[PDB]
Structure formats: C-alpha cells, structure tokens
Design a protein around this ligand. Structure first.
Ligand SMILES: *[C@@H]1O[C@H](C)[C@@H](NC(C)=O)[C@H](O)[C@H]1NC(C)=O
Ligand SMILES: *OP(=O)(O)OC[C@H](O)CO
Length: 161
C-alpha cells in the first residue's frame, strides 16, 4: 500500500464513525409505550366487570373501581384515565422518549354477541356510557401516539369492530 490507501482507510474510518443510525427512537418509544399498554390492560378487568354488572360502561375512574388517573402511573406513564369505558394512558412529559412525550393511547372494548372484543391504538372517545361506537379523540394538538411508536398489534382504528 501507499499513502493514498492509508488516507482512504482514514476516510472510511470517519465514514463509519459518522454513520447514520436507524430510527432507534421509534423502537425505544414502542418499548416505553408497552408500559402504558400494560397499565391500561390492568383496568380492563374493572371496566369489564362494571359494564357486565351495570349494562353501561364506567363513565369515570370512580365507578370503574380503579384509582385516580394521576395515581395510575409508571416510569414512563403519567396517567391512565377511564372515560365511558375507554382506557386512555398518557405518557410522561419528561424523562421519556421525545417522540412519545405527553402522548396518549386508548384501550377500548366493543361488546359482540358472543365476546367482548378489545381494541388498542390511538386515542378514542365514547360519547355516552351506553354508546357502542367510538370516535377519534380530537385534533387539538399532537396528543396522539404515532402509529410507528405503537406495536403492530396495537394500531386499531376508531372504526375497528
Ligand atoms: C360510575 O359511572 C357511571 C357511568 C355513572 N353513571 C352515570 C349515569 O353517569 C356513575 O355516576 C358513576 N358513579 C360514580 C360513583 O362515580
Ligand atoms: O383525571 P386524570 O386521572 O385523568 O388526570 C387529570 C390530570 O389533568 C392529568 O391526567
């Protein structure tokens, strides 16, 4: 070899050092959102029990049997709220992935004739406790967890049934 080869390998070392990284933030965000998925799944039993014994979805955390929304918190989850049978888990505002800062995801259920289908994904809103349909939460600001920061199994739409 010669000096040109050594300069070329130095340039290649620089290329490798300054190589672009994949969107590992998305995967870390998925891992952190898994915590809120588990926390929202925790309240599924209470919400389902109230719906079965009363015929209408739990309007608030109070009659769902679950604690206050601020109390249902984890390392990366700041709140898990139940609104008309829809379990919405909100991320933390700091010490979390920047992609999922202060973002929410919903875990709602639809009662079929033979089962109670459970759907997980972007935030949804049920108007009344007796309503059998859900709709997207609101535009407002970016409170929706991006679908790339959610598991592929947790990307259900508001129209899913
Ligand atoms: C529990 O959620 C119910 C949906 C609600 N009923 C109505 C008609 O709003 C009820 O008031 C709640 N109970 C408590 C103790 O908050
Ligand atoms: O009522 P909830 O437990 O959803 O908490 C309200 C507060 O503004 C942050 O969640």
């Amino acid at each position: 070899f010669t000096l040109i080869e050594l300069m070329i390998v130095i340039a290649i070392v620089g290329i490798l050092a300054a190589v672009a990284l994949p969107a590992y933030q998305d995967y870390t965000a998925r891992a952190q959102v898994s915590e809120a998925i588990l926390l929202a799944e925790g309240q599924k039993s209470a919400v389902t029990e109230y719906y079965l014994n009363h015929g209408e979805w739990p309007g608030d955390n109070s009659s769902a049997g679950v604690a206050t929304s601020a109390d249902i918190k984890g390392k990366y989850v700041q709140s898990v709220t139940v609104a008309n049978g829809v379990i919405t888990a909100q991320m933390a505002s700091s010490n979390v992935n920047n992609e999922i800062k202060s973002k929410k995801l919903s875990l709602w259920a639809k009662r079929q004739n033979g089962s109670v289908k459970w759907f997980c994904g972007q935030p949804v809103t049920r108007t009344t406790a007796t309503a059998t349909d859900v709709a997207a939460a609101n535009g407002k600001t970016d409170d929706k967890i991006n679908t790339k920061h959610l598991p592929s199994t947790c990307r259900d739409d508001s129209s899913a049934s």
